[PDB]
From a paper:
Phosphatidylethanolamine (PE), a major component of the cellular membrane across all domains of life, is synthesized exclusively by membrane-anchored phosphatidylserine decarboxylase (PSD) in most bacteria. PSD is translated as an inactive proenzyme and undergoes self-cleavage between a conserved Gly-Ser pair to become an active αβ-heterodimer. This maturation step results in the post-translational modification of the N-terminus serine to pyruvoyl in the α-subunit, which is an indispensable prosthetic group for decarboxylation activity. After the proenzyme undergoes auto-proteolysis, an active complex is formed between the α- and β-chains, which are mainly responsible for catalytic activity and membrane association, respectively.
To identify the molecular determinants required for substrate recognition and binding, we first attempted to form a stable covalent linkage between PSD and a phospholipid via sodium cyanoborohydride (NaCNBH3)-dependent reduction of a Schiff base intermediate. Among these samples, 8PE- and 10PE-linked PSD1–287 yielded crystals, which diffracted to 2.12 Å and 2.70 Å resolution, respectively. These X-ray diffraction data were used to determine the structures shown in Fig. 4C; they are further denoted as 8PE-PSD and 10PE-PSD, respectively. The overall conformation of PSD in both PE-bound structures is highly homologous to that in apo structures (r.m.s.d. of Cαs = 0.218 Å for 8PE-PSD; 0.399 Å and 0.390 Å for the 10PE-PSD αβ-heterotetramer). For instance, the entire sn-2 acyl chains could be modeled in 10PE-PSD, whereas most sn-1 acyl chains were disordered because of the relatively shallow binding pocket. In both structures, the sn-2 acyl chains extend to the hydrophobic surface of the N-terminal helical domain, where the membrane association is presumed to occur. The phosphate group of PE forms hydrogen bonds with the side chain of Tyr-137 and the backbone amide group of Val-167 in both PE-bound structures, and an additional hydrogen bond is identified with the side chain of Ser-166 in 10PE-PSD. The orientation of Pvl-254-linked PE in both structures suggests that His-144 is likely to interact with the departing carboxyl group of PS. Solid electron densities were observed in all subunits of PE connected to Pvl-254.
Residue numbers in the entry:
A (entry chain C): 13 to 253
B (entry chain D): 254 to 287
C (entry chain A): 9 to 253
D (entry chain B): 254 to 292
The structure:
């Protein structure tokens, strides 16, 4: 199967308003994936005009309490830990017997990579089941965003264990922030079907897929037109297309 | 989907409980300052 | 069809074919190629189309030293490839001309490398087009010390003038190798951009860069001229080539 | 294929004769240094 063509198709489908057929595909999805519509702001599977509207569904305000201890960096996405720990120089663990370059992940940006040499990484896996928006792990001033064209491999555990440099070659958006904990990078990596990435400050980054690397910068906190986000605040999301 | 965090060296320690396949919910503790 | 075709699969196929040693069938495909494309085997170091063990050996053929005289005036930067000028002139800030009403970012071409882009903001650019007809090795336009090489994964669109006029950011999205040199004319970039079928890039100092296609950006550095393990090339010296694969 | 050269600002002038589709042969003049060098 051709992964891009399939993704473009699913995105056409996911964005069409088909009332009963949308509800059907949503309901099959909810059932097959064991989705917990309890936590949804609108639990009635009939409340969603398009499939994508459902995929990107909000949660009930109360159900994601943000630990308020200002020394605690909180989790940015629902799902499960893929891998985490020390960055062994430039080496990041993907799966058993599969490492990848920090520089590769950051699309050859040797300056950014240097900030994180021997630092800490967390790779969170969002399954179709899970809420598909991404929240800030701490307060931060947005400094840099880099869009990286790439492949649309699956990112499930099977694929992680078998495709080399998976996260360094799949289409992704790199967000760099200044924080009270020094520089912090939060990277949204797309997958097959679910290849559309947004940020709250820039809307939908992809599609379209123009095949080139784009970089945006913002000033330091103390300046006109700087962008600040708070621990636990929504910063971006994934949808189909 | 996937989200990747990078933190600067000696700035945070990951909560020791967390390991591969640990469940994550937005706002639960990920790491603690040093 | 440029978005329809599976450009990689076709290129992998042609590369399988171009690298097989098939005596009579190699000579046949070479000869059809030579005839259809008006190739001037007069200029070749081995003009007998039968002298080439594989198609690729032919594609990457050397020329007779004497047919490419190198202007020795050290004020003159010479052409690095046989073919025709696509476009050239001033880099309008970050803007490079691709075709009429099609610009592309200098930063895009350099795969987001804002440091390298700064070297060339408001500078000069030349885009040379090699057709299948032409000799497919690339020579230095002047003396240089190799400092930086960046491999950039990307698409394998055609790069003919028709495609140039129609596919946006063609050279910024197609697979390529960026070579940065120190020269007596300051920093100089020489970028080898692949195309469909002709997607394999080599340099003289590193052999074949692609394939394989590992889908990530790779960067290598070399020291300044006066050092152990530095790499220096002379005006008109071969620095790389394109082949099928 | 295609080859792209980048030069720093005020370092070279392209031969004025050259335009889109002008034929290129290795070793022919492409540009001339803005600063004088000598043998």
């Amino acid at each position: 199967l051709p992964k891009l063509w399939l993704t473009r198709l699913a995105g056409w489908g996911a964005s069409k308003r088909a009332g009963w057929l949308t509800k059907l595909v949503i309901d099959l999805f909810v059932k097959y994936y064991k989705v917990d519509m309890k936590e949804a702001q609108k639990p009635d599977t009939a409340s969603y005009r398009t499939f994508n509207e459902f995929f990107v569904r909000p949660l009930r305000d109360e159900v994601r309490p943000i630990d308020t201890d200002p020394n605690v960096l909180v989790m940015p996405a629902d799902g499960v830990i893929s891998q985490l720990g020390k960055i062994e120089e430039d080496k990041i663990l993907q799966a058993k017997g599969h490492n990848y370059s920090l520089e590769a992940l950051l699309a050859g940006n040797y300056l950014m990579a240097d900030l994180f040499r021997n630092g800490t990484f967390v790779t969170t896996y969002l399954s179709p089941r899970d809420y598909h928006r991404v929240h800030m792990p701490c307060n931060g001033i947005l400094r840099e965003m880099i869009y990286v064209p790439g492949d649309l491999f699956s990112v499930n555990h099977l694929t992680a264990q078998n495709v080399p440099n998976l996260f360094a070659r799949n289409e992704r958006v790199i967000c760099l922030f200044d924080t009270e904990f020094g520089p912090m990078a939060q990277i949204l990596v797309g997958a097959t079907i679910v290849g559309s990435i947004e940020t709250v400050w820039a809307g939908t980054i992809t599609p379209p897929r123009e095949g080139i690397i784009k970089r945006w910068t913002w000033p330091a906190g103390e300046n006109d037109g700087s962008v600040a986000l708070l621990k636990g605040q929504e910063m971006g999301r994934f949808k189909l297309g | 989907x996937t989200v990747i965090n990078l933190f600067a060296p000696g700035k945070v320690n990951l909560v020791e409980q967390l390991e591969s396949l640990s469940v994550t919910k937005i706002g639960q503790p990920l790491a603690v300052s040093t």
